[PDB]
Structures are given as structure tokens and as C-alpha cells.
Amino acid sequence: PFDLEISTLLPYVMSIYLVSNYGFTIVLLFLLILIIGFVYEINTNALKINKHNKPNTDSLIYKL
Amino acid sequence: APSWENIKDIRLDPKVHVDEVYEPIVNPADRYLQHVSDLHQYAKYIMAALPKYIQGFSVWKDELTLHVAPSAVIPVTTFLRDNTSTQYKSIIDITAVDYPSRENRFEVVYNFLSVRHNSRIRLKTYATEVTPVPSITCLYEGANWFEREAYDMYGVFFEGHPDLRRIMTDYGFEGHPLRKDFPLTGYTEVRWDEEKRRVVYEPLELTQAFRNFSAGSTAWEPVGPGRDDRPDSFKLPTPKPE
Amino acid sequence: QSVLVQMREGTPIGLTGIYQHPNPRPALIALYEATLKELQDKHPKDSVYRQSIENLTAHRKQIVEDNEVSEVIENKIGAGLIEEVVIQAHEELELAKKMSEWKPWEELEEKPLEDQWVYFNKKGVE
Amino acid sequence: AIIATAFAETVKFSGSKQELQKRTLALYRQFLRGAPTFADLYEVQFSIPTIRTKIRQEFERHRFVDDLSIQNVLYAKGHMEYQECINFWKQQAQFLKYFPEEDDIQGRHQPSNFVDKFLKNRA
Amino acid sequence: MLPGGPVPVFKKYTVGSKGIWEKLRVLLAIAPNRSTGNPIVPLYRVPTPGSRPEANVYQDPSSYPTNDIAENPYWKRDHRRAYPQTAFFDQKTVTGLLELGSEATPRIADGEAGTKALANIANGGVSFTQALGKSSKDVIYGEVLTVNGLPPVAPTLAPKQWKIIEGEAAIYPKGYPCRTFH
Amino acid sequence: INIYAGGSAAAAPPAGFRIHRPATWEESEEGALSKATKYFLLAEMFRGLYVVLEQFFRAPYTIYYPFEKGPVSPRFRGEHALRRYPSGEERCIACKLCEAICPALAITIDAEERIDGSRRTTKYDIDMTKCIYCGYCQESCPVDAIVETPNVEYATETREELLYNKEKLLANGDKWELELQYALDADAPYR
Numbered sequence: 005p006f007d008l009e010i011s012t013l014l015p016y017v018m019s020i021y022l023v024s025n026y027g028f029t030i031v032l033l034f035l036l037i038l039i040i041g042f043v044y045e046i047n048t049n050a051l052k053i054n055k056h057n058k059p060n061t062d063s064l065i066y067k068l
Numbered sequence: 069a070p071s072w073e074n075i076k077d078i079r080l081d082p083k084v085h086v087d088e089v090y091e092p093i094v095n096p097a098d099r100y101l102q103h104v105s106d107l108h109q110y111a112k113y114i115m116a117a118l119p120k121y122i123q124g125f126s127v128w129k130d131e132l133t134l135h136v137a138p139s140a141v142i143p144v145t146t147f148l149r150d151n152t153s154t155q156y157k158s159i160i161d162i163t164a165v166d167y168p169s170r171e172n173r174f175e176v177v178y179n180f181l182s183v184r185h186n187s188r189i190r191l192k193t194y195a196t197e198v199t200p201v202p203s204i205t206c207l208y209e210g211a212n213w214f215e216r217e218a219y220d221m222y223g224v225f226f227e228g229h230p231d232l233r234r235i236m237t238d239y240g241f242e243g244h245p246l247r248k249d250f251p252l253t254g255y256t257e258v259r260w261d262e263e264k265r266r267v268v269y270e271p272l273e274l275t276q277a278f279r280n281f282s283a284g285s286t287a288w289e290p291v292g293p294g295r296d297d298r299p300d301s302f303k304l305p306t307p308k309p310e
Numbered sequence: 311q312s313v314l315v316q317m318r319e320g321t322p323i324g325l326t327g328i329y330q331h332p333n334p335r336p337a338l339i340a341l342y343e344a345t346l347k348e349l350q351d352k353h354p355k356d357s358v359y360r361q362s363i364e365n366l367t368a369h370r371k372q373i374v375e376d377n378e379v380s381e382v383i384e385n386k387i388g389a390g391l392i393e394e395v396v397i398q399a400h401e402e403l404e405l406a407k408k409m410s411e412w413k414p415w416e417e418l419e420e421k422p423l424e425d426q427w428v429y430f431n432k433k434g435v436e
Numbered sequence: 437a438i439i440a441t442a443f444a445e446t447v448k449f450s451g452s453k454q455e456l457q458k459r460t461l462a463l464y465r466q467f468l469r470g471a472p473t474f475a476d477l478y479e480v481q482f483s484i485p486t487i488r489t490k491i492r493q494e495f496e497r498h499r500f501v502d503d504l505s506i507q508n509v510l511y512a513k514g515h516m517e518y519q520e521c522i523n524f525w526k527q528q529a530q531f532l533k534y535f536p537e538e539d540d541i542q543g544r545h546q547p548s549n550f551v552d553k554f555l556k557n558r559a
Numbered sequence: 560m561l562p563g564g565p566v567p568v569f570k571k572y573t574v575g576s577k578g579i580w581e582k583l584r585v586l587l588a589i590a591p592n593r594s595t596g597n598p599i600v601p602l603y604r605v606p607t608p609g610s611r612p613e614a615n616v617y618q619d620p621s622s623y624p625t626n627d628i629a630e631n632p633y634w635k636r637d638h639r640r641a642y643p644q645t646a647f648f649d650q651k652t653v654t655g656l657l658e659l660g661s662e663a664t665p666r667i668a669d670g671e672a673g674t675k676a677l678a679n680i681a682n683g684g685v686s687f688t689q690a691l692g693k694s695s696k697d698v699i700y701g702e703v704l705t706v707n708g709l710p711p712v713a714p715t716l717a718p719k720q721w722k723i724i725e726g727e728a729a730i731y732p733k734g735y736p737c738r739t740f741h
Numbered sequence: 742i743n744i745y746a747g748g749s750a751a752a753a754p755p756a757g758f759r760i761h762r763p764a765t766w767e768e769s770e771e772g773a774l775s776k777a778t779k780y781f782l783l784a785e786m787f788r789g790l791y792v793v794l795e796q797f798f799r800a801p802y803t804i805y806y807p808f809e810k811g812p813v814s815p816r817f818r819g820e821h822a823l824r825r826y827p828s829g830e831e832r833c834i835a836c837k838l839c840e841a842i843c844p845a846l847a848i849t850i851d852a853e854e855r856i857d858g859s860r861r862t863t864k865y866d867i868d869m870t871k872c873i874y875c876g877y878c879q880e881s882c883p884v885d886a887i888v889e890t891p892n893v894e895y896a897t898e899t900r901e902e903l904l905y906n907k908e909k910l911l912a913n914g915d916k917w918e919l920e921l922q923y924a925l926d927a928d929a930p931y932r
């Protein structure tokens with residue numbers, strides 16, 4: 005999808021004059037909508053790798 | 069103005085001149101006497117504190133040794149790891165030694181360290197080719213590899229060990245090298261057999277045989293009996309003559 | 311009742327794995343009293359182990375009761391920082407509970423053979 | 437903690453022959469079940485039955501050993517070898533150390549009576 | 560400055576730049592103090608080790624009381640045959656020190672009586688726990704433990720009182736996670 | 742002054758052992774935009790690259806070996822050699838100290854009474870595939886016969902050219918005698 009976004013941006017850059025100030029605003033709402041999904045991806049932390057053998061951080065407690 | 073091209077040629081600088089060198093004559097063991105009396109007192113405390121286990125103790129030049137039996141290894145190690153005065157937390161080494169003249173030929177040796185008090189201590193047991201030894205991996209995880217070594221080298225079996233297997237010697241090696249019955253060269257050797265196309269193990273044959281030269285050993289006693297350094301507080305009293 | 315020996319999270323002191331202990335002195339006092347209890351109950355009075363650990367816990371406990379500052383207590387108890395002192399207390403207590411089951415004060419279980427413990431010193435063997 | 441490897445058994449010296457009987461039988465069973473793996477992992481030039489024959493021979497070697505401690509030692513050594521073989525630690529040479537017979541006949545004269553040994557100075 | 564630098568270039572024994580190139584280097588250098596590291600040919604390894612004059616005057620070095628020819632017997636400076644014995648103490652030899660005492664603090668009867676008293680312990684006549692229970696407070700608190708009653712600690716031969724260096728003397732500044740102990 | 746319980750004045754912690762505290766984003770004496778610029782323009786990276794470039798303009802250390810050799814010392818230990826006296830007689834007397842102290846047991850000697858009534862060798866071998874080049878053999882000889890040359894250029898295509906015999910050593914000493922005299926004249930006083 006990010007490749008399809010950046011490839012769909014090609015017509016804008018090659019028609020940028022003829023779509024003066026209208027298609028500008030249109031592509032901004034386009035990019036903002038796509039930035040939303042990027043925001044969802046980051047804050048989920050999808051691309052992060054997760055480790056199983058965790059370092060213990062409990063406390064050492066002795067029953068008396 | 070100054071530069072490496074105008075740098076001082078130190079090679080010509082005048083050098084110290086000493087006419088006579090004065091080095092006093094001194095024994096290196098007079099340095100140790102007070103520490104030795106201290107180690108004797110500490111060992112005496114430990115023997116009084118664990119009479120069930122400690123058979124004896126020796127001292128020699130800021131080195132202590134405690135003699136025990138295979139049953140007493142885990143308990144004494146717990147004392148030496150957890151007691152306040154003896155926080156011997158680090159495991160420096162494990163070693164076996166072969167004394168075939170004994171019934172129990174092997175003599176396992178633990179060395180220990182206390183970074184807290186800045187001291188080392190030893191701990192000796194005994195074993196046989198069939199009588200095992202308890203493993204202190206329950207306490208010191210670093211003993212894992214050292215006990216695997218002592219097994220592979222001498223054949224001692226460390227009971228309770230999660231994975232006791234050879235570590236140094238070849239994967240199919242049959243024998244325990246550092247035994248005094250094991251010949252230097254071993255029993256086998258390897259070559260490439262062009263026929264089978266495989267590294268193959270064959271009986272040993274050397275093109276120059278081993279020459280020992282331990283037959284030139286001295287016939288005269290080289291270093292006579294030493295010198296007592298026991299503190300007088302640990303010498304068995306002489307009764308007054310009358 | 312339960313006690314906190316070692317915080318494995320929080321503010322780090324200069325050692326790794328050890329972290330600042332909130333309210334150490336009460337924990338030290340409870341652990342010292344529990345060690346004295348196990349010794350006074352399960353161990354013989356005439357055993358050197360008991361007397362040694364008793365004087366040790368009593369003296370460390372006095373240094374913990376009279377003093378309030380931890381830096382001072384550390385300069386008096388010559389065993390690391392106070393968060394290491396609590397761990398020494400815990401280890402001593404568990405050793406007491408273990409030694410109550412074993413019987414170190416008893417007489418020798420295995421007596422070595424005469425051939426054992428002879429090392430190249432008998433003047434007539436080599 | 438330094439954890440044990442795959443097929444590791446903790447060294448435990450049984451006090452009786454009746455338990456070691458069972459442990460030895462489990463070891464023999466594992467060797468047999470794993471013999472095809474010993475044929476795949478090591479590029480072997482003979483049969484799985486011949487491997488099982490050699491295994492039976494190696495267990496018949498010490499069939500008549502009545503001292504308990506020596507039996508415990510033998511069992512521990514055998515479990516070591518099973519761990520060495522099933523995990524692909526050994527290479528082909530260290531494994532075919534156990535199969536001299538399968539390799540081609542070494543020459544012609546293999547003395548078996550006195551006179552040949554004398555002619556070869558092996559008596 | 561401190562006792563450990565920084566030091567300029569004209570005291571470092573390296574092959575540097577000369578002329579306008581030095582002005583350019585001191586301009587374009589992160590630290591103009593620094594050296595190229597190539598040694599100075601006239602000095603380094605000159606004269607060559609196989610042509611040192613000092614080898615003709617050289618004589619085997621010595622120390623006075625060991626080179627003395629008259630009152631220098633070997634049996635006084637034989638430190639090998641004076642080696643300290645490996646002492647051994649089994650429970651027998653320790654209970655005698657307990658039931659009896661030592662040459663420094665005797666508690667033994669005179670005559671053949673005390674001799675056989677030693678003999679009773681040389682053999683299994685009295686045990687270590689028996690004489691641990693037969694030991695008065697002055698014995699334990701003064702020969703097993705301390706006079707104060709506390710057990711002895713693992714002795715140190717050469718004690719080390721540590722000290723911390725912070726700030727400017729330290730090897731690294733404050734921010735870094737390493738410190739410096741004297 | 743002080744009485745200690747399972748402790749000491751050495752094992753008491755250092756005065757300042759307790760590290761102060763980790764600093765947070767607050768209590769940061771460097772504004773957010775400054776460390777942001779260092780974060781986005783890769784400052785320390787450019788600095789390291791410049792320290793790399795300054796080396797690009799400095800003298801390389803390399804030498805051309807076959808035309809320029811590296812430093813060599815009289816104490817150096819390379820190939821072996823058996824020397825002679827100025828008379829032309831060989832120095833070896835078969836004391837067999839070189840055969841005894843040698844760690845690797847490379848040396849192999851066999852002597853007998855020479856026709857002129859003297860003690861001399863008929864066999865002196867060195868397996869340079871057993872040799873570790875320790876120099877204990879040039880140290881034991883009480884006549885300075887066996888030596889170790891600075892030569893290191895004696896590689897071969899076969900392993901049997903390395904089982905040096907007496908003749909191969911006597912010629913090697915006839916060859917390198919001038920170099921051996923330099924090294925001996927500047928090494929003997931210390932040896």
C-alpha cells in the first residue's frame with residue numbers, strides 16, 4: 005500500500021499546474037488519510053521484534 | 069619556532085650512574101607469618117563450627133586448605149557461600165589429581181574466592197573411578213564446565229550434573245588422558261585413506277619414539293626438610309620436664 | 311509475614327541487579343530476629359556456630375537500632391552497602407534453617423583412611 | 437542458568453540393580469528407534485539391521501558385569517554416546533569407528549595359527 | 560593542566576609537517592596536538608642494536624652482599640632449603656590444643672602425667688565435641704572466637720582501602736557510565 | 742577504634758560508592774533543539790569521518806618486503822647453524838645438552854671417538870617441523886656451536902628438506918658466519 009500511495013502520487017506531480025489549488029487540497033486530504041494508517045502502525049509497534057526470554061524484574065521476597 | 073626538527077635528542081641526555089647496587093638478603097616467607105597465624109585461627113573456628121565434616125586443614129604461605137569427604141561438599145559449600153564471615157561467592161576452579169598410591173586415587177580440589185573480604189580458600193575431597201562426587205552446580209553455575217572438564221580429563225563423576233559429557237577430547241575418544249596410566253601419545257592416530265575416502269583411526273606408530281630423560285633424575289636429596297612456621301599458639305605443648 | 315530482600319527494579323546503585331531498597335532497617339531487624347529465633351530454638355546452646363552467629367546478629371542489630379543513617383551503618387558494618395547487608399542477612403538465615411536439618415555440631419561421620427592425606431613429605435618414599 | 441542440552445539426563449547413581457535394569461533397557465530402546473537417524477545423519481554405506489546388530493553386540497559386551505557402580509558408569513557413558521550421536525555432533529569417522537567390519541577385507545594373510553604369526557614375528 | 564597532558568607537538572617524537580603545510584594542518588585538524596605517528600628516522604632505533612657501543616663495557620650486574628667474596632656463605636642466603644613446611648592439623652591435633660593449650664598458653668600437667676595426657680589424645684581417648692563442651696568461656700572466647708565473641712573473618716594479606724576519584728582527575732567525565740578508583 | 746562483625750574497614754564501601762542518580766529529560770543542560778540538530782545532522786558521525794580523512798593524507802606505513810626488510814635484532818631466532826673455530830675445526834663436542842633441554846626433542850645426536858682421539862659427532866639432526874625456536878639450545882652450549890641465525894627465508898616444497906643433518910648445518914654456519922659474528926659481538930655480553 006505505501007508503494008501504491010507513492011505511485012498514485014505520480015499523476016499529481018505531473019498534473020500539478022492544471023490542478024491548481026483544488027487538486028492540491030485533494031492530495032493533502034489523501035496524504036493525511038494515509039498518515040492516519042501510518043500512525044496506527046507505529047503505535048501498535050507492528051514492526052518491532054519481541055523477545056520471550058525476559059530478564060526477571062519481579063522482586064526477591066522471602067516469607068518469614 | 070620549536071618543531072620536531074629542533075626536538076631534543078634524549079639519547080645523549082645524561083644517564084643515572086650507580087656504583088654499588090644494594091639488595092638486602094631476605095626470606096620471602098617472613099612476610100607471611102601474621103597472615104598465617106590468622107588463617108590458623110580461622111580454620112580452627114571453622115573446624116569447631118562444623119566438626120561433623122572437617123577432617124583437617126593445612127596451611128602453607130597464605131593458602132588455606134580444608135579436607136573433607138564427598139558427603140560434606142554441599143553443606144560446607146553452603147556455609148562458605150552464605151555465612152557472613154566467609155562470603156566465598158566466586159568459584160575459581162575445579163581440579164582433580166591422580167595419586168594411584170592411595171585407595172581413593174583421585175582428589176578433587178575446589179578453589180574459592182571472596183571479593184568481599186579479599187581472600188581465597190580451598191576445599192579437597194576424594195573419589196574413585198566409580199565413586200562419584202556431588203555437584204555444586206546447585207550453587208555455583210560456573211562449576212558446570214569445570215566439572216565436565218574434570219570428568220573428561222580424569223574420569224570423575226559429578227552426581228546431579230544436568231549434562232555431563234566430554235568437552236575437550238574427541239567425540240569418540242575412549243580413555244581419560246591425565247591419568248598416570250594413560251600414555252602420553254595415546255593409543256590412536258588418524259590418517260586419510262584414499263580408498264575409503266575417510267579420516268580413519270589406526271593404531272599408533274611414531275617415526276621418532278618418545279625419549280623421556282627422566283632417568284637422569286638426581287640420586288641425591290635436593291632440598292632437605294624445610295623450616296617450621298607454625299605459630300606457637302598452634303604447637304602442641306611440651307610438658308615441663310618436672 | 312514477608313520481607314523484601316532485593317528490589318530488582320528502580321533506582322540503580324552502583325551495582326547491577328541490585329537497586330535501592332526502600333525502608334531497609336526494618337527488614338534487617340526482622341530478618342536478624344528470625345535468625346536468632348531459629349538458632350535459639352533448633353540449635354544447641356554449646357555449639358560455636360550458634361554463639362558466633364548470635365553475637366554477629368546482635369552486634370549488627372545494635373548497629374542498626376542505634377543508628378539511623380545508612381551511610382553510617384555501612385561504615386560500621388564493614389560489609390558492602392546496606393542493600394548487600396540485607397542479602398547477607400537472608401543468606402545467613404537460609405543457612406541457619408538448612409543447618410538445623412543437617413547436624414554440623416555432631417561428631418565426624420566419615421573418618422579418613424590413613425593412606426589419604428599424605429603428600430610427598432615423609433622423607434623415605436622418594 | 438546454564439540449561440541442559442537436548443537429550444541430557446542428569447547423572448544419578450542408582451542404588452539397586454533392579455532400577456538400572458530398566459534404565460539400560462530404555463537406552464537400548466532409544467538406540468534402536470534412533471538407528472535410522474544414525475543412518476541418515478551419517479552417510480552410511482550399510483544396513484539399519486547391521487547397526488542394530490552392532491548395538492546388540494555392544495550391549496552384550498558388558499552383559500556379565502555384576503558390580504553395581506561399574507554398571508552405573510557404563511550406563512552413563514552410553515547415554516553420553518547416544519547424546520553425541522543423535523545430536524549431529526559426531527562426524528562420519530567417529531561413528532564408523534564402531535564399524536570396522538563393514539570396511540573391505542584388509543589384505544589376505546590375517547594370522548590365526550602359530551606358524552603364520554612366527555613367520556610374521558607376532559607370536 | 561594535569562599530570563597527564565595535554566602536551567604539544569614539538570615534544571612528541573613523530574614526523575610532522577613543515578612550513579605552510581603546518582599552518583594548514585593546525586587549521587584543518589580536529590586536534591592540532593595530534594601526530595602522524597611516523598617515527599623520526601635519525602632517532603628511533605639509532606644506533607642500531609647490533610652496533611651499540613654499550614656492549615663492550617657491559618659486565619654482568621650484581622648486588623653487594625651476594626657478590627661479596629669473604630663473609631657471604633650460601634647457607635645464610637639459601638632461601639630454598641628454608642622453605643616453610645606444609646602444616647597439617649587433623650581433629651586430633653586440634654582437640655589437644657583445646658583440651659590442653661599451646662606453647663604460648665599452656666594448660667598442661669608437668670611430667671610423664673602430662674605426657675600420657677597428650678597420648679590419650681594422640682589416640683582416640685577424648686573427642687573434639689567432648690572437649691568443645693568441656694571448654695570454659697575463656698577458652699572459646701579467646702582461642703576459637705575473639706575476645707569480643709565474634710567469629711574471625713577471612714583474612715587479607717595485603718588489604719586495599721578503595722577510594723573514588725571524581726570530576727577532573729577522573730579518566731572519563733561525569734556523564735559516562737564508567738568511574739575511576741584509586 | 743571500631744569493632745567489626747563479619748566485616749572490615751576495607752570491605753566497608755567507598756565513601757562515594759552510591760552513584761548519584763540518572764538524570765531525566767528535565768535537568769538536561771542542553772536544549773532540545775541543540776540535541777535535535779546533533780540527532781538529525783549526525784554530528785559525531787561527520788567527526789569520525791573527518792578523523793578518517795586526515796589519515797588519507799598521511800604517510801602509509803607499508804614497506805616492500807623483498808626489497809626492504811623489516812627490523813631484525815641480534816637476539817633474533819631463525820634458522821639453525823653449526824659453527825667452527827677460526828682453525829676450521831668444528832665446535833660441537835657432543836655434550837648433548839641441546840638434546841636434553843630442547844622442549845620439542847627435535848635434536849638427535851650420536852657421537853663416538855674420532856680417529857684423532859677427540860670427542861666429536863657423527864650425527865646431528867634437527868627436525869625444524871618439531872622446533873619451536875626457543876633458543877634454549879644456543880643458551881646451553883658451552884662452546885657457542887649451535888646458534889640461531891636471523892635468517893627466516895628457508896621455506897621449501899617438501900617436508901624432508903626440513904630434516905636438517907650435520908652437513909646442511911655446517912654449511913649453513915660457513916655461510917652465515919659473518920652475520921653470526923655481528924650478532925654475537927653484540928649479544929654475548931648480555932648472554
Ligand code: SF4
Nearest residue numbers: 843873874875876878
Ligand atoms: S631453539 Fe629450536 S632446536 Fe633449539 S631446543 Fe628450542 S626448539 Fe629445539
Ligand code: SF4
Nearest residue numbers: 833834836837839882
Ligand atoms: S650443546 Fe653445543 S657442543 Fe653440546 S651437543 Fe649441542 S651443539 Fe654440540
